[PDB]
């Protein structure tokens, strides 16, 4: 549960002291010195003589057109934290502004705080600018390795998704979100803006969207600085914000001024927001218009006007870096220098190379420190859920009448589970959901919370389950749902977002950043302590699209995911959920992780229940099992034939298969895998089962027949150096399907229970089964021609129960 | 060029008649009714007694709740349409409204004449019910079997990308883009609002957004419904719209009256259209305020308000069928029936069961028809592009100074390939880029054409190669660039986008659909003629992400595109560009190339050119190839070790490491590989290589090092079954990598030309070679070592130039 820190929502009541902005401007002024230093300076980062090209780096990496606009916020941004005492979270849209973010760092003194390598004195200032974007260094981002960071920005445009997730059951939490114009033109961004509607000003926190309005991308100008600033101001207050606007930079108006004029229009904003807050201890039905902020400031604010001959501040020029190179000519290194001096760092520095004690005055002290917030290493504030008795959900039914058993639907029993983590850990968990929660069957949630809802009510007849405050919230946006999960992940709580299958990858990118996000953390950032995975339920999946159609049907996000598994990181788990049981047991192991990516692929159809608890539990700790239960064969000599299963579906119709080889009297070894990555290569994965575990289960000699959810593909390439591979004959989706039955579906795919009985005789003996193979092929076109005159699928397919099953 | 259909931009100067509204409401009837029916019935289309239960479908599949607001609609629309003469394609953003596409086809004719056992008569509407989402009958979306769709909207959100792709360079062309107040809530629909600043009302055509606001998606309310008026038309003039709001169904307003107040506003908007158009071809640099409507109706309108006591119309619950069963009870069956007799269908039909004339009289004819539309078929459309000899843009120095020469940029010579494209084929031919045209090196382009910019201009200093039309347009959103190109092609025209290889990422799931909307295509639809390729350019790759870090390494585009290479459609290209000359040869296919996606991956750093272009054709045509020249073994028995890359940078490394295993006198081949899917069994892709062919390239008996620009996963999973498999030590991209030097991103991946030259002898000889890999293994952390010291690349790494240039 989010903590409480400093003092929340207070107004200053006294104008911002003139001793304050004087503080701020020296911020300002070192801050871009530290800025074009890291990006520009090996050594002598004082300019000490002789300064000479010498000192400067010789592939220029960084970007400065975003940076001298942060500097300038943050600088204002840490003088409000300090006078206020308000626990403040920033997001830094512009991400390629990793140097205002790692100055921040060095100035508070979280980054001498962790990495006291990188000392406050001339020396350490000298491995701080050579350190970034540079073998054996820094990013060039404001990656996972800056203290104050949740959000790289690298990927541009889940600013604001990562700003309102963080403020939701935050109550104390200020999140000044600065947003690229760039970044506004995203699609996320774009959506990210009507959140306001989806969070509540008195049981959530309060986000401040600050649109960095610096006119320009990387080689054009952006849509919201040439549109009328009239169509600006509609448009913000259209999406429920009341718009301030800033200016500065333009003209000559000199740096004392447009702090003081910046200062009192940001006390004024926040004197509207001190008043949201308080209105919402009394009225929160009502929704507030929100303010917003536009900076608009010329892009490179600071930097040379002109430099040979192009204009350089306030156009996409400045957007790398103004000056292309500051060692092929000495006029160049001549721009550098002057540039450099115009700080006038001999004010800012002692000669013992420390920034003087009057730059840093203003600034915040301990855990109010943009560095040190613990919102900001979200794992510190992080609790373990309280999960109640996985035993209380299992289906019982199985132990009583046997594996195969019943027409349930297994997300529900992961939604009577969820429901009961939401009632005993409140405003520690939340359900995201694109409009899909009740269509996965998770709605038993609905039971102890409400879909949150900040927008207009109208009638109880439509109305149902919705309250101005709730843990569950939904949108039609899988971008806004990773996004909100995603933040309020990283400010330490925990949570689950469910899709339809096909529809995971709209946010494939967001799955790739994430995971670098903690690929990176898990490697080289132990200060950085674990966050609640990101746990991710795949349903309404590929097999059971039939009524959808082929627009639906793309299990691909395994093939994705799969790209994040390597160095032994264990940041991706890709889940097969069997059944309900094998669903709980995933779904215990996912809400304990950590640093995980969590992919929980489950059925929402009726279908049968093959394992107990305790069975599911098993196959899941090594990720595959052997199914004694269901094997004619007694160990691996006797068995002709090993068939395989991965999905509750192949499992199905494997299953099937088996009942069907069995009347023929074939022996065969019936597997099942729950866990994907187990099948990786033990040299790649220490995780995975060992080659001696692998061809215990798969048998070393005798073919395999292998039926998979996904695309055979992502199998083919996991087992390539395993035992046996080459004696796998792997079925997966195939690109058919269309809206049709559930047969027709896995038969179009060659993965329906006739065509895997004719593939398991085939790999027997084809000569002599070839009968009963031709039998099969035949009735395979009987079963389709039954549906198409029907309308509904033949009675074989359809009343079929596993054998092991009794009355 | 799009064609000049019917006569644009035409007022009326009269009022709609009573005629045709009469019509229209005998339209939404009768298309209510064939979609009620498409949902619930098997058989006994019009009620001939008895009928019963039995006559209902046993499983329903459809949405009702949209599908009646998209009756009305495509009603108005095409009235519209015949009293106006006005070439318009609509795009049914809520695409699950699929029988509101159907009955629209059915009613305009194309549905017959595309499908001729589908009669005009009892018989016929029996087989259109029940094929309706049936085994071996017909999809539930508006699918590409569809007369008359260029978007299927099963995934929502590119409603607005694909309407304003549609009309760029389609001047006489409107599109009315029916976007649901759910999809709205989409960040690629939200964006798409915007485009209205990237296209011109003189050279562009008009984009009409409809906001379907029927106040619900699945189980929830939307937004945009339930935030106040005054915000929502704040919120679309803040955006460049001039909006017009339309209520309608909320209270007891006879239909008529409904019909004649929306034929108004709908005049009153298109009048404003008008006005619009007329102005752009005297003025074009002053972009207007474009109408968008807002259509505020109950969602599942003029089905049962209350069933079993719950609220259904103007609710949630009428989003897939608002009577959950027909069969189950006596008193849900009469639910059904008398909700079929409130559309009176006596009045619509004649004995034969054919829709009355008196019914459809108002509908336009020929080719304005939804359904005949060229635009909807935009490979009848498509000419074949006037490209230039290729011979022009070879890199003639490999010739000259031999094989592995030079420093040149590859995707610079495509950047000039396709310059004099759009020279030669004005109007036909655009480049798309999320502000990445420039980074990409495709600014050549820029001699001939211009960004298009319609937001606002302030100065010559900072505006360059900006014009209000352009053949090149710019948003940061991949969303749009790939939704604005996939209209482009749909409408019968060709492009090409440029994207960071990291962020193709962004747009994964409009490959998919666009993949799974050709594959559908080439299966089953002969009558959709073919449509030029979707051309991507992935370059500033990953192997030249060192200036940008972590956040930028991400080729696994590959990974997406192998998911959709199946049945022999052939609708996917993987190609990696070796260099400027494979890239030249790799264009020209792709450019000539239908019914395709094309990922082309191509390095936009400077390096070496290896092949001329009639080798580089000669590698493309079979698709891998011996490097004969390169190679010390002169036939595959004498061969030690088998030296394979795909893409520009594996390539680099590995033509480095045959150099060091040249003065080590080590006899191997050398294999280039620029499609990838030659590689794919034989048994799978009837287009690639011959388990003979494989063999003879790659050795039967060989250690082959496979060096891959992508996940090595990909190619470990496509070999499976081909000659010598087991044998391939396959090396790509690991998930290693930072803010560092070009050697450091190869090394921390173990794809650096040392360590290739170290596993090339430790496939060999482990023991002979053991002092040599030793060597190279030190040598690797000296050269980053030396990068760390100095800030740059050890020389050794930088300098290097194959042994066989002059
Ligand atoms: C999703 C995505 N697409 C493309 C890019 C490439 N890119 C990185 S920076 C940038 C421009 C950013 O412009 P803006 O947000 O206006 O930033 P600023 O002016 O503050 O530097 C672009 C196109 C990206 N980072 N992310
Ligand atoms: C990208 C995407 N995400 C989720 C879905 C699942 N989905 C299907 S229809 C729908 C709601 C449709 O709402 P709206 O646009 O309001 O359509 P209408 O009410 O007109 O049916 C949802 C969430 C989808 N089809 N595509
Ligand atoms: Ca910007
Ligand atoms: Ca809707």
């Given at each position: 549960t989010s903590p409480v820190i400093g003092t929340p929502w207070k107004k200053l009541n006294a104008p911002v002291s003139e001793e304050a902005l004087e503080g701020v401007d020296k911020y300002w002024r070192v801050a871009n010195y530290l800025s074009i230093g890291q990006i520009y300076l090996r050594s002598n980062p004082l300019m000490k003589?002789?300064?000479?090209?010498?000192?400067?780096?010789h592939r220029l990496v960084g970007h400065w057109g975003t940076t001298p606009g942060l500097n300038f916020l943050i600088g204002h941004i840490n003088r409000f934290i300090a006078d206020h005492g308000q626990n403040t979270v920033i997001i830094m849209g512009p991400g390629h502004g990793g140097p205002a973010g790692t100055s921040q760092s060095y100035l508070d003194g979280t980054y001498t705080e962790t990495?006291?390598?990188?000392?406050?004195d001339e020396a350490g200032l000298q491995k701080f600018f050579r350190q970034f974007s540079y073998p054996g260094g820094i990013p060039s981002h404001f990656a996972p390795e800056t203290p104050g960071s949740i959000h790289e920005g690298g990927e541009l445009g889940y600013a604001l998704s990562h700003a309102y997730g963080a403020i939701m059951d935050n109550p104390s939490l200020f999140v000044p979100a600065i947003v690229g114009d760039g970044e506004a033109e995203t699609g996320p961004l774009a959506t990210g803006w009507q959140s306001n509607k989806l969070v509540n000003p008195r049981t959530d926190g309060i986000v401040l969207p600050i649109?960095?309005?610096?006119?320009?991308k990387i080689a054009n100008p952006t849509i919201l600085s040439r549109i009328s600033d009239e169509e600006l101001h509609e448009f913000f207050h259209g999406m429920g914000y009341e718009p301030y606007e800033f200016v500065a930079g333009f003209d000559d108006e000199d740096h004392m001024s447009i702090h003081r004029r910046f200062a009192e229009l940001w006390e004024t904003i926040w004197d509207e927001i001190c008043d949201i807050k308080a209105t919402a201890q009394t009225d929160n039905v009502h929704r507030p218009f929100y303010p917003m902020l536009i900076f608009r400031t010329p892009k490179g604010w600071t930097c040379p006007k002109y430099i040979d001959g192009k204009k350089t501040?306030?156009?996409?020029?400045?957007?790398?870096?103004?000056?292309?190179?500051?060692?092929?000519?000495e006029a160049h290194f001549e721009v550098l220098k002057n540039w450099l001096e115009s700080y006038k760092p001999e004010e800012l520095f002692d000669a013992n190379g420390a920034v003087k004690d009057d730059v840093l005055a203003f600034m915040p002290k301990g855990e109010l420190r943009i560095g040190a917030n613990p919102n900001a290493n979200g794992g510190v504030i992080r609790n373990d859920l309280k999960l109640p008795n996985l035993e209380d959900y299992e289906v019982k039914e199985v132990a009583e009448y046997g594996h195969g058993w019943g027409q349930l639907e297994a997300t529900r029993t992961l939604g009577a589970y969820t429901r009961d983590i939401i009632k005993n850990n409140p405003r520690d968990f939340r359900i995201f959901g694109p409009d899909e929660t009740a269509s996965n069957r998770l709605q038993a949630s609905y039971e102890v919370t409400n879909k949150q809802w900040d927008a207009g009510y109208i009638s109880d007849e439509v109305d149902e389950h919705m309250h101005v405050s709730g843990q569950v919230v939904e949108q039609l946006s899988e971008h806004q749902m990773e996004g909100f999960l995603e933040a309020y992940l990283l400010t330490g709580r925990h949570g689950i977002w469910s899709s339809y299958e096909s529809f995971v990858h709209v946010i494939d990118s967001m799955l790739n950043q994430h995971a670098k996000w903690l690929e990176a953390t898990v490697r080289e950032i132990p200060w950085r302590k674990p966050i609640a995975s990101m746990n991710l339920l795949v349903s309404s999946h590929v097999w059971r699209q039939d009524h959808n159609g082929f627009s639906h049907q793309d299990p691909g996000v395994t093939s994705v995911l799969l790209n994040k598994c390597f160095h032994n990181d264990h940041v991706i788990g890709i889940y097969f959920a069997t059944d309900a049981n094998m669903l709980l047991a995933i779904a215990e192991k996912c809400y304990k992780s950590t640093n995980k990516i969590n992919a929980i692929i489950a059925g929402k159809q009726p279908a049968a229940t093959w394992l107990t608890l305790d069975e599911a539990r098993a196959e899941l700790e090594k990720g595959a099992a052997a199914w004694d239960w269901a094997s004619?064969?007694?160990?691996n000599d006797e068995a002709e034939v090993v068939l395989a299963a991965a999905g509750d579906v192949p499992t199905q119709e494997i299953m099937a298969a088996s009942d069907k080889l069995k009347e023929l009297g074939v022996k065969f070894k019936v597997v099942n895998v729950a866990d994907l990555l187990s099948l990786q290569s033990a040299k790649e994965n220490d995780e995975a089962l060992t080659d001696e575990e692998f061809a215990d289960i798969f048998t070393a000699d005798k073919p395999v027949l292998f039926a998979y959810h996904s695309y055979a593909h992502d199998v083919r390439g996991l087992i390539?150096?395993?035992?046996?591979?080459?004696?796998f004959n792997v079925h997966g989706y195939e690109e058919e399907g269309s809206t049709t039955t559930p047969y027709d579906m896995v038969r179009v795919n060659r993965i329906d229970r006739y065509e895997l009985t004719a593939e398991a005789l085939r790999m027997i003996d084809a000569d002599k089964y070839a009968d009963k193979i031709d039998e099969l092929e035949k009735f395979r076109d009987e079963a389709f021609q039954f549906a198409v005159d029907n309308g509904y699928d033949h009675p074989d397919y359809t009343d079929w129960v596993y054998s092991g099953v009794n009355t």
């Open positions: 003589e002789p300064f000479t090209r010498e000192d400067v780096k990495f006291p390598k990188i000392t406050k649109l960095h309005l610096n006119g320009y501040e306030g156009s996409w020029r400045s957007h790398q870096v103004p000056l292309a190179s500051a060692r092929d000519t004619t064969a007694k160990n390539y150096d395993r035992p046996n591979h080459d004696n």
